[PDB]
Each structure stands twice: as structure tokens, then as C-alpha cells.
């Protein structure tokens, strides 16, 4: 299910917080 190619997208959305 979960797509390894999406993981960095999340790492980005995180930074836009931190």
C-alpha cells in the first residue's frame, strides 16, 4: 500500500513547519 516514493514529500511538509 504505502509508497516509498511519497516519504520525502512528508519530510518536506514537515520542514515547512520546523
Amino acid at each position, epitope marked *: 500500500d504505502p*509508497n516509498w516514493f511519497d516519504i520525502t514529500a512528508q519530510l*518536506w511538509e514537515f520542514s515547512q513547519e520546523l
Partner: antibody, heavy 125, light 109 residues
Framework: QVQLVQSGAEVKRPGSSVTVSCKAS????????LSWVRQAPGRGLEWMGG????????NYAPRFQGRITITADRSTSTAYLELNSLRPEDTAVYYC??????????????????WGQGTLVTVSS | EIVLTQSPGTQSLSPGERATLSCRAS???????LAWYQQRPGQAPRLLIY???SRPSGVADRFSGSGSGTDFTLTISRLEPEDFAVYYC?????????FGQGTKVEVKL
């Protein structure tokens, strides 16, 4: 925005191991996905696996599982592909490939915007 | 594992003409995560189209991506000489990414 340089051409015998280096310069290294894509001569591209250096999150194509190891070194912005149990069928040019970004520290796009120059590995006896 | 079958194997056209390249995926591509790449002899491949129809900065206007699910098309509107290369499609909609066998676009005559 990013330059990747790979280690040089290498000559191996069957049953041995190869490790190819890909060094990254420009932008930031840790949070963009880097894949290895090889190409046998005269034939087409094949995705082998990849890594996210932050936490070394790996992902391997099933047909290489058990023979392949991908590692990333954050202080040198360098990723490594290790392929063992080599056979002549493994003769090919090996490429490192890194995620693109939108708009260098921009949103990753998944697809491969940045390539290394390639590394021919020949396996023969 | 998703198979990406590319059609036709060998496009033979003249400079200034139009190239329509097909990519057929054996299952639906997750989130339309499909890319197109150009490769000239001895060179590393180059990203043309990402997310099915998006275009990276620096990529030429004449290139266009389209499609959804299982059929995708890469179009070139006005073939420049610098376009006679090999073209690959790629899916990254699931962890296991695959490439197509590629289409040779060669100068006819």
C-alpha cells in the same frame, strides 16, 4: 541544480562483489530520494532500488533482494550500491538518480531529475 | 510488478514532423505517478515529463505529457534534430518502480 559524480569503470569476475559510489554536490542531501538504475548494453533501463539518506530508508526491487545493499553517508553526501554474486548478465552501465524538486530545497517530485554520468561494470571470465 | 509496454518500437520520422509515443501499463499507475525520459547515445537520460503531464523548468515547450491510469502518451509537436534519441516511460506509483523497454525515434531516409 545538483551534480552527481560516480566512481569509475570497474572490471569484475563472476562470483565477486561490486560497490559503486555516487557523490552529490549542490542543494541538500539527506531528504531527497536516490535510486540506482542500470542499463545493459543495447538494452533498456532497469530500476534496482533506492535510499533516503535520512534514517537510511531503503527500498529494493524484489529481483535483487539478497544480492543488493544500498547505503548513504551524510557527511560526504555520497550514496553507495553494493551488488554481489555477480554474473556476466550483470554487465551494464550503472546510474545513480536523485529526486527532482519543484520551482533546490523545493518540494520533491519523486521522478528523477538528476543523473550521475554512469559506471560501466563488466563481469567476465 | 507493473509492466510498461511501449509502442511503437521504432518511430521513423523527418525533422519538423510530429511524434506520438505510447506507454501501456499492465495495471493502473498509482496517483498518475508516471514520468518520461530522453536518452541520447552515451548520455545519461534526461527528465522531460513528471506526474504524467508536468514539465520541469528548462524542458522544451514542444514536449507534452498526457493520460491517466493505464494509457499514457508523450507527444512532440515539432521534431527538432536534437530529439532523435531513445525515450523511456517510468512509473513510481508504488514502491516497486519499473521502466518501459523504450522507443527508438530515428531519422527516416
Amino acid at each position: 541544480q545538483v551534480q552527481l559524480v560516480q566512481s569509475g569503470a570497474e572490471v569484475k569476475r563472476p562470483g565477486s562483489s561490486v560497490t559503486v559510489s555516487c557523490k552529490a554536490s549542490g542543494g541538500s542531501f539527506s531528504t531527497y530520494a536516490l535510486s540506482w538504475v542500470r542499463q545493459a548494453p543495447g538494452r533498456g533501463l532497469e530500476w534496482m532500488g533506492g535510499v533516503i539518506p535520512l534514517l537510511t530508508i531503503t527500498n529494493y526491487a524484489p529481483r535483487f533482494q539478497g544480492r543488493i545493499t544500498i547505503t548513504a553517508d551524510r557527511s560526504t553526501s555520497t550514496a553507495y550500491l553494493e551488488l554481489n554474486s555477480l554474473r556476466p548478465e550483470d554487465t551494464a552501465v550503472y546510474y545513480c538518480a536523485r529526486e527532482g524538486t519543484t520551482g533546490w530545497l523545493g518540494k520533491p517530485i519523486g521522478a528523477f531529475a538528476h543523473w550521475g554520468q554512469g559506471t560501466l561494470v563488466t563481469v567476465s571470465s | 510488478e507493473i509492466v510498461l509496454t511501449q509502442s511503437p518500437g521504432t518511430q521513423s520520422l523527418s525533422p519538423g514532423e510530429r511524434a506520438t509515443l505510447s506507454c501501456r501499463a499492465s495495471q493502473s499507475v498509482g496517483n498518475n505517478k508516471l514520468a518520461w525520459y530522453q536518452q541520447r547515445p552515451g548520455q545519461a537520460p534526461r527528465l522531460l515529463i513528471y506526474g504524467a503531464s508536468s514539465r520541469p523548468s528548462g524542458v522544451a515547450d514542444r514536449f507534452s505529457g498526457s493520460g491517466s491510469g493505464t494509457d499514457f502518451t508523450l507527444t512532440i509537436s515539432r521534431l527538432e534534430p536534437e530529439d532523435f534519441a531513445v525515450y523511456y516511460c517510468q512509473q513510481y506509483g508504488q514502491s516497486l518502480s519499473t521502466f518501459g523497454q523504450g522507443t527508438k525515434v530515428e531519422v527516416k531516409l
